[PDB]
Amino acid sequence: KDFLPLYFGWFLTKKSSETLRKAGQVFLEELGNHKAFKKELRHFISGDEKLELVSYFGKRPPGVLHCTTKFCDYGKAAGAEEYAQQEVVKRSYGKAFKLSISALFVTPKTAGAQVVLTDQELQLWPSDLDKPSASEGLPPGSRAHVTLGCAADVQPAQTGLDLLDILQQVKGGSQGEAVGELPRGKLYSLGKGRWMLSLTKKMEVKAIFTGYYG
């Protein structure tokens, strides 16, 4: 009788969202104007001057930003029911957390921010079994992220997949030397239109763990 949320996750406060939102926009402009990116557009899009990444990532989160833990679809998603049953979930419901943003990334499909979860937060991370083939050798929670924008033709949960793809390269020493220096950190060109800004100082955001029902 009692149905679950659309998904659980950490929803940022109004200011943490505004700060992170603004930060993401600066990156999409700094990256768009960087000559290292403009000479690589052939790997990003298949058409043609300069591209404005902000407009490119037109499908943005309208309200407050968030970090999804477990997509439930009101209980239809596999493992949704077992996740909500967890004591840590019910105990943590409505409680405040601080999330650490380590990097900002961009791909032909998505623009997001990498979240590094603490051990207590990892307790709220789902350990469902029907895994991806992208999480091999990566620690659980690596997928943790905040979506800042999607291209027009992109599916949801793509931002999470893109991140894992990026981190798989970093693990394989395939990230390469930095191709630039932005005021917030070092810029990286990972090829295939993938980019990463490793923040000098990790950005902390306040958030509330809860459920979205839409």
Ligand SMILES: Nc1ncnc2c1ncn2[C@@H]1O[C@H](COP(=O)(O)O)[C@@H](O)[C@H]1OP(=O)(O)O
């Ligand atoms: N099958 C899914 N698995 C995991 N996360 C999902 C899934 N479907 C949607 N989401 C995520 O839950 C939220 C639902 O948003 P939407 O309104 O588009 O359905 C999004 O943050 C999305 O992740 P993401 O932010 O990477 O797109």
